[PDB]
């Protein structure tokens, strides 16, 4: 909702409450999953060509008792945009690989989980410096590219570490050395085609015997396709990764091949059914694991839109992973899940 628009400054205050419940034989995901998100997007006109902006988004879980608080910052960044040249922003933001993979992250509840948060340059993460050029100086409609740098996020401070520390340090599964990446997308009418590449130094804390997938750098290569017209949405992405994909709590995959596909239709009366397939196939994993499925599921669901502010959905994760030693060791969910959600948003 735009709550302020005066003398060239605009402020949009937005959010949602998702009354949400999971049904699953897996009791670690089963039960109340209610949550809310809040955010703001602000923009200020500096000149006719130059605009400054900032965005912040926060998630607060609504499913805990009052003696605890489970909340986090999704994004927080400030930036400058110049008409027909580009933009730059810095902060917690999305990695440029997400420019392509976001195209299949459109499912009612699940999806978008061949990668995670704080996972090199694949999704949300800290310390992104992002440069973007839209429409190639305004001379090629629909063509966009981006180049991104990520600074090191290392070991926690004040915990007796003698190397690799940063002020905002964290556990090794969520660390990263310096990284660089890029994306190109082209959209003509309904069609879209895109590609992205990322390369991040891996830290010493990540390259210990306690984690599978030791390596100097984490690399990702992504291609994507999209069709979005005539009430039909189709998209697919394929990603090859090296020492970049987490294998639950075990560490990372030496190599992984990720694939996601989605098909959706929008009825006039407000119903939007969705069908999707995701898989992540790991190779040469180490410790005798050899080749294993990290993720494999079919997602069938539907959303009903009452209007732009109220909707309800059901999403059914038909989980094709089988319960074995590998998935047990990594703590990967192999059970089906049904989600039922009712969402108010502004």
């Amino acid at each position: 909702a735009e709550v302020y628009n005066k003398d060239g400054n605009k402020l949009d205050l937005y959010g949602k409450v998702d009354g949400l419940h999971y049904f699953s034989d897996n009791k670690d995901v089963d039960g109340d999953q209610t949550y809310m998100r809040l955010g703001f997007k602000g923009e200020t006109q500096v000149t006719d060509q130059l605009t400054g902006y900032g965005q912040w988004e926060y998630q607060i879980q609504g499913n805990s008792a009052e003696n605890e608080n489970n909340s986090w910052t999704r994004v927080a960044f400030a930036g400058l945009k110049f008409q027909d040249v580009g933009s730059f922003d810095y902060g917690r933001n999305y990695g440029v690989v997400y420019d392509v993979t976001s195209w299949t992250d459109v499912l009612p509840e699940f999806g978008g989980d061949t990668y995670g948060s704080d996972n090199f340059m694949q999704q949300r993460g800290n310390g992104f410096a992002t440069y973007r050029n839209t429409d190639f100086f305004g001379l090629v409609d629909g063509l966009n590219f981006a180049v991104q740098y990520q600074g090191k996020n290392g070991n926690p401070s004040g915990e007796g570490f003698t190397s690799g520390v940063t002020n905002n340090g964290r556990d090794a599964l969520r660390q990263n050395g310096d990284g660089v990446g890029g994306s190109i997308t082209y959209d003509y009418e309904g069609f879209g085609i895109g590609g992205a590449i990322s390369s991040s130094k891996r830290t010493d804390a990540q390259n210990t015997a306690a984690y599978i997938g030791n390596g100097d750098r984490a690399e990702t290569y992504t291609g994507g396709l999209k069709y979005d017209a005539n009430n039909i949405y189709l998209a697919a992405q394929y990603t090859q990764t090296y020492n970049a994909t987490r294998v639950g709590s075990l560490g990372w995959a030496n190599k992984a091949q990720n694939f996601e596909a989605v098909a959706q239709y929008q009825f006039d009366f407000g119903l939007r059914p969705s069908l999707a397939y995701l898989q992540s196939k790991g190779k040469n994993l180490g410790r005798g694991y050899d080749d294993e499925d990290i993720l494999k599921y079919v997602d069938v669901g539907a959303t009903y839109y009452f209007n732009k502010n109220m909707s309800t959905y059901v999403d059914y994760k038909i989980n094709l992973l089988d319960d074995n030693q590998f998935t047990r060791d990594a703590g990967i969910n192999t059970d089906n899940i049904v989600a039922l959600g009712l969402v108010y948003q502004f």
């Binding site: 929008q266 009903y304 732009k308 502010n309 109220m310 909707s311 309800t312 969402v343 948003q345 502004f346």
Partner: protein, 396 residues
């Protein structure tokens, strides 16, 4: 003293009524939360509509009004200008013309307007409109005949800025010359000036609803549009100057007789067809069972065929005074029922998708006017002599 329209308005107002409709419809289920910075893209929902109508038969309590007001009505109420309130029931409607007929239940001391002869209208002629613009009541506005079409939609500047297409258009003698309509469908509200169906057409369409149950307008059953549409391009159509056939309707004459999406009709009975428009209007000057041979285009295809009653103008829960979508079939060859629903109150009574009803619960039902004429006289025992082609069953 000074001139005034009040003296004839006093002889006219008793014929203008107010109409309050209550009904429901199918809306999509809202998906939450709601994000106003995210341009996206089943349950019954009650709604309320309100409009004006004109008493056209004092004895039968027949009121003419717009179809955009009573459409989907479950409950239709009428309030006379003197304040007496009544209930009303659907007797007919026709979405093309946006004209509908209703009947006051239990009329007592009513006044009907006199209908003037539309054909004698001329542009500088004076006009007066009466309607319920914003709900706040019955407003009259004046002006003149702006354009006489020449379908003869009447154009007049006696409209209303941002208001809903009222109802009666009357001349300086207090006679009905047209019913004001809304050409901004499924909206109501005007383009800037007023459009009325001429009184002579109103009389004609209206009698049909009475004496048949619906208006005899045959459809070619094709559906499509112009040669500009994304599908005429996305499918690249050769020689573009006609009506694009996007689809041939099921169980239709176009379907039955022969035709398939893509062909662009170029003529109708020898005459050139340069736009769906031209065609949609031409097929509207032909009553059921008529035969019209038209030229198609694929490489050079052409056929001849006979059309049946359209599906836009149909009936629902008003045939059987009780409660529960039939329509007429060809000439006086009974009443053919169409697409049954999900609640299935009428299907539950042994009525399929194509069940005719020539038996008036005992007698002849060549049409819905007759049929309904019986389900109103003898509400005691009812056995529908229906025969959906072969099966000749008799349900209650």
């Amino acid at each position: 003293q000074m001139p005034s329209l009040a003296p004839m308005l006093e002889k006219v107002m008793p014929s203008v009524v107010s109409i309050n409709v209550e009904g429901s419809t199918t809306v999509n289920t809202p998906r939450m939360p709601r994000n106003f910075q995210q341009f996206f893209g089943g349950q019954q929902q009650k709604f309320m509509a309100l409009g004006s109508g004109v008493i056209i038969d004092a004895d039968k309590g027949y009121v003419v009004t717009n179809n955009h007001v009573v459409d989907n009505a479950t409950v239709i109420k009428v309030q006379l200008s003197d304040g007496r309130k009544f209930d009303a029931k659907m007797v007919g409607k026709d979405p093309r013309s946006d004209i509908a007929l209703i009947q006051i239940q239990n009329p007592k001391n009513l006044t009907a307007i006199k209908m003037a002869d539309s054909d004698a209208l001329r542009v500088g002629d004076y006009t007066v409109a009466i309607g319920n613009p914003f709900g706040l009541g019955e407003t009259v506005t004046s002006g003149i005949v702006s354009a006489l079409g020449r379908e003869n939609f009447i154009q007049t500047d006696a409209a209303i800025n941002r208001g809903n297409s009222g109802g009666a258009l009357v001349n300086l003698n207090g006679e009905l010359i047209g019913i004001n309509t809304a050409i901004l469908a499924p909206d109501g509200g005007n383009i800037g000036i007023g459009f009325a169906i001429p009184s002579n057409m109103v009389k004609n369409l209206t009698s049909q609803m009475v004496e048949y149950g619906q208006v005899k307008r045959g459809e070619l059953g094709i559906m499509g549009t112009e040669l500009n549409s994304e599908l005429a391009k996305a499918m690249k159509v050769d020689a573009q100057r006609g009506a694009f056939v996007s689809q041939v309707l099921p169980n239709s004459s176009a379907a039955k007789a022969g035709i398939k999406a893509g062909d662009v009709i170029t003529s109708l009975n020898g005459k050139p067809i340069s736009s769906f428009a031209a065609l949609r209007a031409q097929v509207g000057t032909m009553p059921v069972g008529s035969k019209l041979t038209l030229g198609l285009l694929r490489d050079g295809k052409q056929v001849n065929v006979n059309l049946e009653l359209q599906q836009s103008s149909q009936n629902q829960v008003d045939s059987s005074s009780i409660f529960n979508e039939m329509s007429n079939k060809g000439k006086d060859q009974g009443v053919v029922v169409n697409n049954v629903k999900t609640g299935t109150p009428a299907a539950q009574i042994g009525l399929k998708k194509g069940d005719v009803i020539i038996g008036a619960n005992q007698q002849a039902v060549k049409n819905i006017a007759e049929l309904r004429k019986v389900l109103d006289s003898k509400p005691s025992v009812l056995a529908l002599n229906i025969q959906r082609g072969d099966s000749t069953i008799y349900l209650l």
